[model samples]
Target: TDEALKPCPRCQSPAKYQPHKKRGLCSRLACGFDFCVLCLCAYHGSEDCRRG
Candidate 1:
């Protein structure tokens, strides 16, 4: 298990990993932002992620 703390790009709240979904979810309930774990951008469902 690879556990790490990452901040949401949108709200700057701490995010947790969703291994099954291969994404990150913001811990802040109010924010609840979903983002890409690789590019750290907003979640792009079925779309290619543009890495920096």
Candidate 2:
């Protein structure tokens, strides 16, 4: 299993995280919510996801 990937904060489902992308996507088809892996919040786009 990918260490970077973790259970999604939203649906509590399995998801993959990409640090470079700074995003995590839920694999569950029922709850396909993409979010910020670092923040554990919904992905709000480049401006929101981008971290200094």
Candidate 3:
């Protein structure tokens, strides 16, 4: 489906990216944003922050 590992948004930001491993992610900070941190964007479970 997807390929390539996107850079970290909080780090070297990339326009569009995808996890080379297609791993599932989730935020654990106080921000209450648990989602799949994709290589290309931040998956907030409900929506996708493709702006990464």
Candidate 4:
């Protein structure tokens, strides 16, 4: 695991984070790994199982 990644309950662990993008309140530069859907700004994308 790349220390940068943590086990998020909402994401249910091992799940990649989907940035909300730049929506001011979304993933809007204000955050980098905001996994919560509430703080989402834009719908970026998703990651794999976070494992190789």
Please estimate how well model 4 matches the true structure, expressed as its whole-model Cα lDDT: 0.33
Higher-lDDT candidate of 3 and 4: 3
Candidate 1, residues 1-52, lDDT tens digits: the string is: 7667777887888788775666888888888898987788888767777845
Top model by TM-score, which number? 2
| Runs in model 2 lying further than 4 Å from the true structure | 48-52
Candidate 3, residue 19: lDDT: 44
- Candidate 2 shows a clash count of 0
How many steric clashes between backbone atoms does each model show? Answer: 0, 0, 2, 4
Task: List, residue by residue over 1-52, the lDDT tens digit for candidate 4.
Answer: 4533333433334434433432122232333333433333233334322322
Clashes of 4: 4
lDDT of the candidates, in the order given: 0.80, 0.77, 0.40, 0.33
Check candidate 1 and list the clashing pairs. Answer: none
lDDT of 3 at 24: 38
Q: What's each prediction's TM-score? A: 0.63, 0.68, 0.27, 0.20
lDDT of 3 by residue, 6-31 (tens): 34444443323324434333232333
For candidate 2, the TM-score is 0.68
In terms of lDDT, which candidate is stronger, 1 or 3? 1
What is the Å distance of residue 24 in model 1 from its true position? 0.5
Instruction: In model 4, state the lDDT of residue 18.
Output: 35
Query: How much is the lDDT of residue 41 in candidate 2?
Result: 79
Clashing pairs in 3: 17-40, 25-35
